């Protein structure tokens, strides 16, 4: 279908694999913010002085579904509504109408030079396992090489394989009823591996990190949530 279809496979299971994984009970990560059910973990991990801190977070959202959650996530159209740290963004390539190749810049972190950023994004619904476990909606963004990627002297090429992973828990129907906003559950698990790809000096990115992953996730889940409010359920 397109030359992506098995590297996208890959990266998802890989996910589905590794990244669903719980940690409350995993001394390796250290959970380094808490707010409520939202729960950020990284551990700390440098290749040739340079942070690569993985990044793990996970949060239980009231009232949205998952398929909601990796629209809104995955959708450049209002990208701009949540997104606070991306200076310029290009839709590089099309592949699928689940999959598109973007080009982004994002907010200096002083004194570090501006990053750039070429990344496939794909959403993927992965059927249960077995009949007894959720479905999942995904969204992975990877970087990828490409031809028409821009030159940009101000930015240094970071490299980042993130995903929102999420699965939906609800209150059973009652014969003929909907289910309510009310009794439905969004279970996330958002990961970050990412590659600043040259020098950024440690204790700022991750005094940066600790404090923007949260209040990303907080700002994005809370405009879900907004944004679905008495709309009917996507599930
Ligand atoms: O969830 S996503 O796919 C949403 C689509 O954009 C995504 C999230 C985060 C990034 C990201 C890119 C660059 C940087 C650093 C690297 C050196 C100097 C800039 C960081 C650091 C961690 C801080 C950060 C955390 C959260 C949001 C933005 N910034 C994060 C990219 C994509």
Redesign the pocket.
Known sequence: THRFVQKVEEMVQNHMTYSLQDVGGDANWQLVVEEGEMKVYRREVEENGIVLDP?KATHAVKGVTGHEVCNY?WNVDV?NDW????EN?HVVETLADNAII?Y?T????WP?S??D?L?L?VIRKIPALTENDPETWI?C?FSVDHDSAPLNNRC?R?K?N?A?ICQTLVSPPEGNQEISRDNILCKIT?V?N????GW?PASV?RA??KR??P??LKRFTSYVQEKTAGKPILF
């Open positions: 990044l996530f990208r997104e606070t740290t991306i963004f973007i982004q994002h907010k200096r972190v570090a501006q990053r950023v990344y994004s969204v963004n240094v970071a980042i993130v929102m958002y970050a990412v590659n600043p790809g950024a990115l940066v990190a923007e992953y209040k990303f």
